[PDB]
Amino acid sequence: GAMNSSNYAELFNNDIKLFVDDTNVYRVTVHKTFEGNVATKAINGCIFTLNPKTGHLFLKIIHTSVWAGQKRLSQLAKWKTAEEVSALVRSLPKEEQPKQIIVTRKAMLDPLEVHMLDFPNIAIRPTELRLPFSAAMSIDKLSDVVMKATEPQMVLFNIYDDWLDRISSYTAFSRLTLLLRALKTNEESAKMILLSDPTITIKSYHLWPSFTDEQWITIESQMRDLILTEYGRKYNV
């Protein structure tokens, strides 16, 4: 059924599963026309498809050309997402295909179920979690490759960098969701925290800085403080 606080450890068992987030597939800027009307200009987007156990991220870049001449773009975006996820699954060897796909927004369920009719044994699930994957475009190198794309392009990363060498996938996912929640609530502060100490660098193929275990605890502490503070500045407590 739906994924929630109660069945959270299932994410880290040995059944292959993917989270799919479509929040950054169809992206626009809204602007005024010369006549004083409002129009949108699309910008490149991405599907965020993540194995939470391994950290493998399948980042399908959605180039603005896929919207040309199309109507009802927000609805098409859900079907385009579903088409691309279905294509990804079919491209994987059978032993690599997921047993479950968890969508972060319930409106993806019917589009994905229809595109996956050929895979009756893959369960399509919603979640009750309010996961912060929309903030993936606050990760500088992910945002960079999406904005630079001139054609449709599948891009990869281990969103956990090398963390699994030292921590479990439960702990890696918790760190990730805390980082992303922070970036979503106050990107400027969050990025200030992550980069304040010039001596800690980001390896060329890593998305995050090379913190020691001790430095990660300090970092994670600062990210919590931010999330509670912003919640302070928002609600006045």
Partner 1 sequence: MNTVPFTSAPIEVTIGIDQYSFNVKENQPFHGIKDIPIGHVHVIHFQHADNSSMRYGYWFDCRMGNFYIQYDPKDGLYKMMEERDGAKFENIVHNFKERQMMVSYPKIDEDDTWYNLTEFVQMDKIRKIVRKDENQFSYVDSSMTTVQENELSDPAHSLNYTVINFKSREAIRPGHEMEDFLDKSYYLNTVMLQGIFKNSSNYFGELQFAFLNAMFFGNYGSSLQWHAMIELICSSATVPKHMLDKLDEILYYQIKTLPEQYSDILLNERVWNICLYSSFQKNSLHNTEKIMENKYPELL
Min CB(7)–partner 1 separation in Å: 24
Among positions 113, 220, 225, 230, the unique one binding partner 1 when judged by CB under 8 A: 113
Stretch that binds partner 1, among 17-25, 74-82, 173-181, 218-226 (CB under 8 A): 74-82
173: which 2 tokens?
């996912």
Half-sphere exposure of 114 (CA within 13 A, CB side): 10
d(CA 116, CA 121): 10
Min CB(100)–partner 1 separation in Å: 18
Min CB(197)–partner 1 separation in Å: 49
Pick between residue 62 and residue 176 the one whose CB is nearest to partner 1. Answer: 62
Among positions 56, 73, 79, 216, the unique one binding partner 1 when judged by CB under 8 A: 79
Per DSSP (E only), the strands in the chain are 17-21, 27-32, 38-43, 45-50, 56-62, 100-103, 123-125, 153-158
Pick between residue 7 and residue 91 the one whose CB is nearest to partner 1. Answer: 91
- CA distances in angstroms from 154 to 45, 59, 99, 136, 215, listed in the order given: 12, 6, 22, 15, 33
Pick between residue 78 and residue 181 the one whose CB is nearest to partner 1. Answer: 78
Q: Is 117 among the residues that bind partner 1 (CB under 8 A)? A: yes
d(CA 22, CA 106): 11
Among positions 114, 192, 217, 228, the unique one binding partner 1 when judged by CB under 8 A: 114
Residue 20 in 3-state DSSP? strand
Return the closest-CA partner of residue 20 out of 143, 113, 149.
113
- Site size toward partner 1 (CB under 8 A) is 11
Q: Is 110 among the residues that bind partner 1 (CB under 8 A)? A: yes
Pick between residue 82 and residue 159 the one whose CB is nearest to partner 1. Answer: 82
**Beta carbons of 180 and 208 less than 8 angstroms apart:** no
If you search the block for the tokens 């919603």, which residue do you land on? Answer: 126
Min CB(128)–partner 1 separation in Å: 23
| Residues binding partner 1 (CB under 8 A) | 76, 79, 82-83, 110-111, 113-115, 117-118
